[PDB]
């Protein structure tokens, strides 16, 4: 009757929560955290210093949105965190109220973006070992968890370790290949554009292309993206002229409800049905620094690894992540990759003649469930493995060596 | 009831039961370890994938050959491969049957003593023996007189023999072997425009040479015909799908055997070394040695090699007798067949070395056992 460990997938967006050895993440709540801050002016020599017990006088989760007298302040920003005191407060609140798990008799696994600096991991591990006194800890990249969860798509019994994952995120979407359990360290790239700035662009365009909404209830209006309201588009200008020609049937309407005066307000739906999701393959719209597509990045990263691994990698691309829920995404990526790889093969064959014909490279995109969350099941299987109880860093290791035990990274080595 | 014969080839390992006409285990000598961080913790990760599997997943491993030019460099790798072959593949306990080992001539005594000590101590084999690949080649060929051309992957050597006796003073060993040929092939493939550095591409080039290489009767004529490059170039399909066109390199690398000066070695070719070895022998046995020339090893399967060797020897030798080259089509496993036949011999059942005599005497016993 051994107690199960605890599985947590922290991040910038909706933080997944639940226990190991289970088939559904029970709690999925935002990162919004309340605080009894107000208007002091001395805010850089006493940030808060709440007198008495007012320090803990703050809510958390979905209940924290509807508190109109505090401040909703997200602690995370695309992985990197400025102030981690809010993170500690959120962690204690969750573990006690929601999870109800005693740290001294439980094992915690945490997930961080691959670009997280060593200092943040070291100091969060130190904080955990000092305050929570967790017997064991383990941090790993989320790509492998997604790969493990991808087995459920079809033929679980057929072991398939090779592949590559392009995961989404509220502020980051990364690319990580797997070569029979061992990933490549140098063949990893970080994409800054993600599923948040897209909504920023949507609302920015909407605030001028339409009127009839209140400033407060903007994001709820901007969340038409999460609805059926965005389809990807093999061509841009074609659909532009399609809308500018008819502009009658392709236009949709919004019927949101105000959260203050309970007065209905409506606005039409325009070019944003596709432009947002199209920004992924044209990031230049939002971020001027990163004028680089995604599919070509995928082929480049897959072309910077040994020959024997290039072939199977193209065959296994996993559709996991919230921002990847957009329809026809896989078709576009598959078609683009096939076109570029076929062109490269033809160029290679042109220089050296021959009547032969190489077997065409096969690129296939797999669509399945688990797309919204592919890290939780990986953590559950992580906990269920007995070897996890042995690999996890121990207390005595942190006792005198320090929190450096958690500094191991997949893209470092001397 | 039987015995096991294991040939620790410089590039491949052959093993099987005594009596069978074909080996039951043929895998290359590779002991690979992961190069990356060791990040995954699920389904299958092992600290050292050494063995047959290593070839399949060579793309994320630093393959290293335990044996280099006939002499062992890392004993841990050799013990690991021995354990793998004995247990995973053969699935036969060492105690049940004895083991037969073979090694190239003119090897250091330290290697022999260490191998015997490890075999007798770790696996506690009831008995074993040490022999020479060339003599087993003779046994496989069913002949008692001739000259052996044992051009293996790591070492090439010759050992003149006569009816019922050998000539230890006329043994020549050449370090040139398949590995040097592969290195030269990589170097020339670089001059063509194709680059290969790591060990995985080393295996790829090894396969390419195994499939699309041959010897040239005349070097200058072949070069001239290459100047008219419209019927000699051939194409090979790489795993990634890229196509590589190979022309003069097909008949250039094998010529290094007859022209060691290409690699910069101040030595002579196989023909010259065999001529010198035969000349150092007595006059009367020269006729018999000329009439019988056995060759074995994986480096002598190139088509036309026998014809070129015959032509060169006849040109060097006086043009008044007949020189014959015998090229059996199963020379790859000739050593193993000879070892099996020797083990099957009734008279050899007493020549083995047992644990009692080894312990009482010491490791030096093997030195006096048939040299």
């Amino acid at each position: 009757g051994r107690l199960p460990a605890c599985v947590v997938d922290c991040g910038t967006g909706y933080t997944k929560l639940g226990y190991a050895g289970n088939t559904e993440p029970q709690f999925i709540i935002p990162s919004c955290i309340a605080i009894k801050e107000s208007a002091k002016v001395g805010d850089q020599a006493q940030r808060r210093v709440m007198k008495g017990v007012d320090d803990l006088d703050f809510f958390i989760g979905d209940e924290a949105i509807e508190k109109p007298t505090y401040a909703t302040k997200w602690p995370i920003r695309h992985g990197i965190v400025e102030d981690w005191d809010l993170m500690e407060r959120f962690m204690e609140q969750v573990i006690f109220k929601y999870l109800r798990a005693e740290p001294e008799d439980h094992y915690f696994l945490l997930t961080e973006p691959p670009l997280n600096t060593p200092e943040n991991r070291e100091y969060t591990a130190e904080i955990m070992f000092e305050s929570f006194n967790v017997p064991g800890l383990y941090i790993a990249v989320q790509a492998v968890l997604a790969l493990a969860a991808s087995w459920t798509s079809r033929q679980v019994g057929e072991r398939t370790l090779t592949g590559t994952v392009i995961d989404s995120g509220d502020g980051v979407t990364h690319v990580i290949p797997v070569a029979e359990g061992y990933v490549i360290g140098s063949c990893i790239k970080h994409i800054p554009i993600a599923g948040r700035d897209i909504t920023y662009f949507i609302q920015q365009l909407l605030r001028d292309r339409e009127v009839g909404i209140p400033p407060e209830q903007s994001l709820e209006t901007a969340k038409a993206v999460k609805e059926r309201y965005s389809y990807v588009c093999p061509d841009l200008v074609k659909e532009f002229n399609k809308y500018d020609t008819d502009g009658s049937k392709w236009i949709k309407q919004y019927t949101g409800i105000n959260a203050i005066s309970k007065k209905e307000f409506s606005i039409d739906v325009g070019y944003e049905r596709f432009l947002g999701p199209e920004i992924f393959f044209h990031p230049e719209f939002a971020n001027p620094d990163f004028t680089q597509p995604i599919s070509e990045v995928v082929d480049e990263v897959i072309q910077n690894c040994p020959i024997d691994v290039r072939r199977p990698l193209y065959k296994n691309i996993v559709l996991s992540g919230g921002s990847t829920m957009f329809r026809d995404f896989g078709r576009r990526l598959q078609r683009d990759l096939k076109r570029t790889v076929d062109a490269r093969l033809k160029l290679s064959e042109e220089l050296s003649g021959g009547r032969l014909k190489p077997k065409p490279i096969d690129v296939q995109v797999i669509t399945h469930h688990m797309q919204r969350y592919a890290v939780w099941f990986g953590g559950s299987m992580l906990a269920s493995t007995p070897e996890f109880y042995q690999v996890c860093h121990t207390k005595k290791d942190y006792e005198e060596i320090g929190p450096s035990i958690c500094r191991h990274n997949p893209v470092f080595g001397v | 009831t039987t015995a096991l014969v294991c040939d620790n080839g410089s590039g491949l390992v052959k093993a099987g039961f005594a009596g069978d006409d074909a080996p039951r285990a043929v895998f290359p000598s590779i002991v690979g370890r992961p190069r990356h961080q060791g990040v995954m913790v699920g389904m299958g990760q092992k600290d050292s994938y050494v063995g047959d599997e290593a070839q399949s997943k060579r793309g994320i491993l630093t393959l290293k050959y335990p044996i280099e030019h006939g002499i062992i460099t890392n004993w841990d790798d050799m013990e690991k491969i021995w354990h793998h072959t004995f247990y995973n593949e053969l699935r036969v306990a060492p105690e049940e049957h004895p083991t037969l080992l073979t090694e190239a001539p003119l090897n250091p005594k330290a290697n022999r003593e260490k191998m015997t000590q490890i075999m007798f101590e770790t696996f506690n084999v009831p008995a074993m023996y040490v022999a020479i690949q060339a003599v087993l080649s003779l046994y496989a060929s069913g002949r008692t007189t001739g000259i052996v051309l044992d051009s293996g992957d790591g070492v090439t050597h010759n050992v003149p023999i006569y009816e019922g006796y050998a000539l230890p003073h006329a043994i020549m060993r050449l370090d040139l072997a398949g590995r040097d040929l592969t290195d030269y092939l990589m170097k020339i493939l670089t001059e063509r425009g194709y680059s290969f550095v790591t060990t995985a591409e080393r295996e790829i080039v090894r396969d390419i040479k195994e499939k699309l290489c041959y010897v040239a009767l005349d070097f200058e004529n072949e070069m001239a015909t290459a100047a008219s490059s419209s019927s000699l170039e051939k194409s090979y399909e790489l795993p990634d799908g890229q196509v590589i066109t190979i022309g003069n390199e097909r008949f250039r690398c094998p010529e290094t055997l007859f022209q060691p000066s290409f690699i910069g070695m101040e030595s002579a070719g196989i023909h010259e070394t065999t001529y010198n070895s035969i000349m150092k022998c007595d006059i009367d046995i020269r006729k018999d040695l000329y009439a019988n020339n056995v060759m074995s090893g994986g480096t002598t399967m190139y088509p036309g090699i026998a014809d070129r060797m015959q032509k060169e020897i006849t040109a060097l030798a006086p043009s008044t007798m007949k020189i014959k080259i015998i090229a059996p089509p199963e020379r790859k496993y000739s050593v193993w067949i000879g070892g099996s036949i020797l083990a099957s011999l009734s008279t050899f059942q007493q020549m083995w070395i047992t644990k009692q005599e080894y312990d009482e005497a010491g490791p030096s016993i093997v030195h006096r056992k048939c040299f």
């Binding site: 220089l351 | 425009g193 194709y194 591409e201 790489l238 590589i244």
Partner: peptide
């Protein structure tokens, strides 16, 4: 390069 590496 043409095969192996870019150049």
């Amino acid at each position: 390069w043409x095969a192996x590496c870019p150049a």
